[PDB]
Amino acid sequence: AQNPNCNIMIFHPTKEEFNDFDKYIAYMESQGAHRAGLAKIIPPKEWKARETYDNISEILIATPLQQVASGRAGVFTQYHKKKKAMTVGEYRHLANSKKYQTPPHQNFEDLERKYWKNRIYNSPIYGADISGSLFDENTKQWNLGHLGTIQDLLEKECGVVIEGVNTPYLYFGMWKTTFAWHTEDMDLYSINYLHLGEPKTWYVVPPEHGQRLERLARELFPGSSRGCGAFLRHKVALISPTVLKENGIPFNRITQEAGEFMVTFPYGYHAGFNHGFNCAEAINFATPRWIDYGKMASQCSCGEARVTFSMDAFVRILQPERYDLWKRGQD
Ligand SMILES: O=C(O)CNC(=O)C(=O)O
Ligand SMILES: [Mg+2]
Ligand code: NI
Ligand SMILES: [Zn+2]
């Protein structure tokens, strides 16, 4: 078995190997990459996502989210408070302000310490989930706006044509902006490209150990657990690496820098934070190996998780028994 300790693997494809996305994901899996739950892909030196980022300031963040925490430093939840609209120019200025800027630090490790020590005492503002793309239409390789769609994958594998569309999202981050512990909708893959700015640190639990994370989360968030059998779908809970180590949860960590791709694999729980002003783009995708995970994915039916138009058809076709109850939650 390849990669039995489930370590995060880093790949360096040649320009030739960067042509066929599907084939490269399948190569990574042949080397065991999926066992970790997350892989890093460094693009060939010849490649570029677009010519410059000099003209992005007028993009609108219609609903910036202030991430307010509750709990203790290592075990907390966050809620998203809606703020007034602002442009990317305005947001970048705010990120760089004395109130919100990254503090002086020695290295990534010192910054990670400071994050886990101090995150709960601040409420950073995240420009998340903005429909759109920063890839140039002429970038032919690994263009996240030009991937094969999940609807077409399900049709190719299973023969059923379904409604729905699949488009990328932009994330504008600042220091301490946080992504809570989650897997993707319907335990899909995700791909994330860090277009610009400061790094993003990731934590991941191997898919084969996901249920261990879920059991710990039920213990640490007992009211949430009673309210919903799949409350991590709400994307609000944080558990620190110290806490995971104390409870024997297997995980790994890695920092993504500007110009690098990360891929999350089906049922790979992940969480993390941004080091300072940055812009990432991400999208869900599928492969033939995803189908079985989609069929088994948990669902939130308490009504909190509330998801995209396109998830309807995935539930309807892959989880017909669940469909009725899940849709009650959606309505
Ligand atoms: O970048 C973020 O805030 C969150 N991204 C992801 O969870 C992802 O790409 O799967
Ligand atoms: Mg602009
Ligand atoms: Ni994700
Ligand atoms: Zn729920």
Swiss-Prot record:
One of the protein's GO biological processes: chromatin remodeling
Free-text description of this protein's post-translational modifications in UniProt: Ubiquitinated via 'Lys-63'-linked ubiquitin chains. Deubiquitinated by USP14 with the help of TRIM14 leading to stabilization.
GO molecular function term, any single one: histone H3K9me2/H3K9me3 demethylase activity
EC number per UniProt: 1.14.11.66
Section of the entire sequence shown: 11 to 341 of 523
Name by which UniProt lists this protein: Lysine-specific demethylase 4D
UniProt KW Transcription keyword: yes
Binding site for Zn(2+): C228, H234, C300, C302
GO cellular component labels: blood microparticle; chromatin; nucleoplasm; nucleus; pericentric heterochromatin; site of double-strand break
Stated family: Belongs to the JHDM3 histone demethylase family.
